Amino acid sequence: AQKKGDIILGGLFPIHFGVAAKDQDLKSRPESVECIRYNFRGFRWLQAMIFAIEEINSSPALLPNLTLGYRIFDTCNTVSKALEATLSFVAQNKIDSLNLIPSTIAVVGATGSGVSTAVANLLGLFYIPQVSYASSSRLLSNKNQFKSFLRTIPNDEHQATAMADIIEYFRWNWVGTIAADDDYGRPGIEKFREEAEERDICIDFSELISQYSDEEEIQHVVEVIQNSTAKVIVVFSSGPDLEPLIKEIVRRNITGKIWLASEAWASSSLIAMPQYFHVVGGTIGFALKAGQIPGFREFLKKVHPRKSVHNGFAKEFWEETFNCHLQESVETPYIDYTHLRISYNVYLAVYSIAHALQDIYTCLPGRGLFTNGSCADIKKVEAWQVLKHLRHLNFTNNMGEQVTFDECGDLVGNYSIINWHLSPEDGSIVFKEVGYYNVYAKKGERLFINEEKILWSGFSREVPFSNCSRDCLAGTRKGIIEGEPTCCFECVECPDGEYSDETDASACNKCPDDFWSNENHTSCIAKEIEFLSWTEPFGIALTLFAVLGIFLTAFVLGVFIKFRNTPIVKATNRELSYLLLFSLLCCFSSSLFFIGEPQDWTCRLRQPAFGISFVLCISCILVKTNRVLLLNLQFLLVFLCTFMQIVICVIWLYTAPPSSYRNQELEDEIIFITCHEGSLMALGFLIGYTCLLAAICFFFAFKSRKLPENFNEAKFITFSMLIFFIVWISFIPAYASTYGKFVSAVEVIAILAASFGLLACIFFNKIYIILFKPSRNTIEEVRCS
């Protein structure tokens, strides 16, 4: 393809897919290689270039009086078919200076990354610029290795640093990764694995896909996708690289996932067929921004081979389009496009070169853009002047937006984010635009998404739930790591020690003493303070039993005091019964210390009242016999016997008093307000001295059991000693068996039992002789001995 002009532009296009791979034996002269598979889509691209050139030469508003001509060759998407053309561009630029008439001014560049990489090395010698329409490899973006390379497609790596941001507008963690087994899939997954760990995103699985892979490895990948519990899968792959794979996943029929798409396959019709009716439906993809061209659907239609000479490929496109032959409107992916996404790139690149030449044509002679303010002339233009202007480009394409090439050479633009909503008239995979992204601006304003229009899971509406672990409910903590990566966690129930209220907490928290948890680790309610309480009816029942004995003792005092020097009273010593009656009068009241909540002073002196009361009671009844008794020596002996325990009580209360302790060691819910005894021997001495005195009076009472004197008093004294040792021996098993808030109850019942036991035996019969109907025969002063 070649038409003359004042300024000549080069061009490379992939009209044929691939070459015929013969094995040269080189027995004869080598021959030129053949190309085999015809590309219709590449022919649509070349028609876009011829349309752009005819538009610029038809208008006078841009580049007047300068007819532009093209020279276009067919790369067969191989390097060897490309450099043979590049040696035809490069020649008349500087061949007379290399070796001891049109000149190419720019090249509209090559599709595959390897082809452009090979061509740009040769074109970097002579500083002839090159704008590309499809090359998206990262390594081309070096200004150091390649001097002159410009792109009208943005860099692929930005897709990866776009892609993580979509996740962080929806707040997910768990994700899976599929990459193509190619040169395109590995930079994308490497950069994504960088940015994910940078943004704390954990990836479940990494897999590879190819046309060359076996069906068994595809089955392994199918098992990996079905087994793993991840709701999003990133795919960096080319269009043909999925054609078996999505078909065999449709064989499995999984319909839960929502997919994420790279730029190559997001708009690929080879990755979306209506057989893939709903199972792929709901995904999100990075398309390329498409804008209409007027006239181009009439310019494609108006081609015919023997009518237009300058397009050399028409003579073969006629013959292989519909299968005809020649002597020198139908179903094809030539006419049947529905989005212009690369054809628009070719049209835009040809206008890029057009406005660069315009800025050379109209710069004022005063302030140029070169050394010492001089413009370059237009009828003697060289390549380096055009390159210098072409970095500084800022103009309005007819769509409306600005275009300015970046410092690295990329074109600043907006990736479009699409969703696939099944059009109810169409019933096929139909794309719908939802969100848009900006690579050039700072982070935080790159990505806006309106979420009301996107539909995950086909007809579903709600955001999927794809963390590694479902977050733990209230009453638990975030738990320890389980050997999975750090985004994962387990759920652990809180102990009964502490509570958990705020959701997804790391550790539980405590609370005060006398506040222990309820169940579920809700919070810390109050504990139970368990004391033998007057609010309970059992305590006031015990108090009534205590008061009744005091009243009966007072009656005994009344009948004692009224009858003096009377024949029942006069025999036994008159002060003796008076001293005996006060012993009962205080021993009855002494039981009241063991009821209610223990205060410390009442906890302190409770045992000495017991000790003093029973010591003087047992002493005064032991000195009452008058057989082994004879100033009142009985009174002095009682004083000595009482003071010999009073010394024990004063010493024990001055060296180590008992303490009042809230023993919480018994149970968490119920605390026990009790008393620590202090010195154990101090309580043991007061326990034993009373027992020894009781044994002594028991021995002196039993030795005169039969002898009558004042109505068998020795027998009743023996009975009193018997009931005393009986209740004292019945307290200790009861003491061991009894649980708290009843050991005080067992104590006061035992004291009450001993109290009426020592009350009744001594005095009831004498009360009967003073009170029953034969009292007159009971008391005779000579008699009744």
Add this chain to the structure above:
Amino acid sequence: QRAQKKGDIILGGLFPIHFGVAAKDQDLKSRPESVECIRYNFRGFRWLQAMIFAIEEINSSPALLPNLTLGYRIFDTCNTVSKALEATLSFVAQNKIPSTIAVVGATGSGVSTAVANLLGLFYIPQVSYASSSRLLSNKNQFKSFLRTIPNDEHQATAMADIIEYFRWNWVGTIAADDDYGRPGIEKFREEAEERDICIDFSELISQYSDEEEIQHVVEVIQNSTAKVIVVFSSGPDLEPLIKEIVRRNITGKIWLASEAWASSSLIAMPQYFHVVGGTIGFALKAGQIPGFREFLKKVHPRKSVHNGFAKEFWEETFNISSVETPYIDYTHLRISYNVYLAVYSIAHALQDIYTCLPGRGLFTNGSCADIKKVEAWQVLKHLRHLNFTNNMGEQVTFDECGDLVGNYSIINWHLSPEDGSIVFKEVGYYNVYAKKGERLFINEEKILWSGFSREVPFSNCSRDCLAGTRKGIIEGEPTCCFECVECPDGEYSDETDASACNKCPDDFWSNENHTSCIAKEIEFLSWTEPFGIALTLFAVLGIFLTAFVLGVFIKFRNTPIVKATNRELSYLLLFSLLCCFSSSLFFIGEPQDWTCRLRQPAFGISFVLCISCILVKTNRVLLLNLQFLLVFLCTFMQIVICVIWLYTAPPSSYRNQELEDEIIFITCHEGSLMALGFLIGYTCLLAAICFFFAFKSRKLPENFNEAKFITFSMLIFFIVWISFIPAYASTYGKFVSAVEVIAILAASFGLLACIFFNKIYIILFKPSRNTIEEVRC
């Protein structure tokens, strides 16, 4: 400039005369100019002089290429792609629309894959001499590439097998950014997985790296503990981080080299020795070029017409060839022999073209080419079919892909005391002819580690740990890194390394040492234990005195001491004494099933019969007929209890390992505790019954105050019964059974203290006739 001489057939050439180019950012405000090259290289000039010498020799030898003269055209490469492409255009220019026949070139490897693409279109052959990358091996992408240096796919496997010969685990790597480094290090990372080694850190350096990148690389190499760092890179690329590391005085690392920088005077300097010393690297095979030292000293910049790189060279060496430089200081010829060999390879190609008779056919239908009009596509056909006997005497032929196989040599650096130049003494050969696994060989006493270290260094991630402990715990790390934790008691390890400790045998508990475990001890009072022989002696003495009292009762009979009481009823007390004395022996020894079965009943029946003998002895409230039945009924009311539990719940022997781990304890089981409390209560009740009558009849003086003595006997019995309970509650094993029998022994003597003792005092002493008097009592 360039080198040129006219001839009938011309050859190309590319040689890296300058190391690198000035990195000038281009303004593009003016004419873009041609960049200059930075720092001059002498070694490249020696290589170029080797090629000019080979061409002069071929031109002057009349047996090879007769009567036709070969010329040459050389351009320098400056080790960058741009100057190379500008040169290959000037080769290729005429053929598209004098013609170069071959190109002996592409010293670098990045340059190689561009010059091959641009020469592959026209089918001009290309013979490399130093490019060793593997991507250029295939003959589908590159039609006409041929190497005379071996491929590096052997080198990665050699760098793997050196680890297995020196037994290492932890190693880290860095590579060059070009096609020389990264494919080879991918190959070695592939071959590393089989050998079960661990790769810690991989980093990448290019020659034009900034200060921040080499700062980061020094940080990574400083942090990890790997001694062995493998570097698969060129000469000038590694130079910046060498500047940085020797500025920081890092001293511990051991380096393991590639082919390219293993012998380079750019790095091997006296000033860098305290880092890069002692390293190990591959050097290629030697060669012999005669007549070449003289031809090196025959350069003269006025007389040097045809060469054009002479004059610049003079301005680098003197600003009369005895000045220290790497142009004439070469120990061996390693790469210059390859360039000489490549020029003879093309020479024999054209010689065979000159000698094909018509019948031999290598073109079309058996037709031969012609020398007058020779094309670059025919020389490729003779290049694929080549053999000649080179001047040494081996045979040269190319493989299908293009490489030439050869053995390498591994060398280890040193420091000679003469002038401190780092001297390259060899250690080993790597013969690639033989099978995989019988190639490498390292003589050890010559190889000398960095800092003249005799010992082989340690380079494992984890210390393989002691025989006491065990190692099997991997916390997500690579498997070479592992941890050692002390296995629990009951389990010990008896081998140098294992995943887990085996359980110690039973009747043994694991030692503190954890190397081996020794057996426990059963703790029990024993018959051969002399402390127990004391108790056995007491038992024997008590039995002997019981026999003494019985014999006194036998022979001193008819006496009023004896004849007042019931003469049979005395014998029951003696047999009771013998029985209760004999019953104490069942607690001495290791308890068995029979002993644990019958320990209690013998004591029960013996003591019951003993008390039953003295219940009805007193005949104050008691009077063959009556007393025999009185004993018999209370004997029955204990033997029924005994047979009841000995048929219901026999207590048995029990070995408790519960109390102490290092010493087990053997004791009889409790065995129906009610069926022992019942016997104890029965005994105490029968004791209280006689104690009541003894307290009642205390004052009555009869038969030497018999009732009073009975009261003291019962008092002594209750005294030792009270004394038993804290002694039971206090003592531990091997003592609670000792006190038990001891208590029984005490009680036994108490009976013989009171019952038949003081009466014997009348009978043996002076009161014998007084005791033998029927009037008495």
